[PDB]
DNA sequence: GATCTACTAGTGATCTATGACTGATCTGTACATGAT
DNA sequence: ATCATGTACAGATCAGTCATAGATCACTAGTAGATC
């Protein structure tokens, strides 16, 4: 596909933050995205001065979308990303 | 009725598994050469 | 005139080598238990 990849680790550092997000040697995008989403919803509940809510998950989105009633409606995609300083995959 | 062996509690050293620094490798641009 | 080949330079990433926390090992006082 060139666009799509499976993510493996060389080194499980120790207990490692991301161990809970593993489905083998493979980092699970859906687990990570679910915990991310959970945290965001938790904090969003604690916002009392702004009308902000979490939008229902859109299929094919790497984001957690917020609807803000700043009277007018504003949508904010909070996109979970992994940063890699290695050289770009061959497909590029 | 006292002294040597088997076990428990307690302390502290020694050994054993993980993050940070340095050298080695890789990729590409600028330039010199050689071809039409 | 222009385009392919080889060298230096530059920056970045990757692979290989030391300080720190937890586990393990050694020794001693105190017991009980067995012997004289």
Swiss-Prot record:
Changing residue 42 to A: Increased DNA-binding activity. The modification Phosphoserine is found at residue 61. 2',3'-cGAMP binds at residues 60, 77. It is found in: Nucleus; Chromosome; Cell membrane; Cytoplasm, Cytosol. This is Cyclic GMP-AMP synthase. It comes from Mus musculus (Mouse). The N-terminal disordered part (1-146) is phosphorylated by AURKB during the G2-M transition, blocking CGAS liquid phase separation and preventing activation. GTP binds at residue 77.
């Amino acid at each position: 596909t060139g666009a799509f990849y499976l993510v493996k680790f060389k080194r499980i550092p120790r207990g490692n933050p991301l161990s809970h997000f593993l489905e083998g040697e493979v980092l699970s995008a859906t687990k990570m995205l679910s915990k991310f989403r959970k945290i965001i919803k938790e904090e969003v509940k604690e916002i009392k001065d702004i009308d902000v809510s979490v939008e229902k998950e859109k299929p094919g989105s790497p984001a957690v979308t917020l609807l803000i009633r700043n009277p007018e409606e504003i949508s904010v995609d909070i996109i979970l990303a992994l940063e890699s300083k290695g050289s770009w995959p061959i497909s590029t």
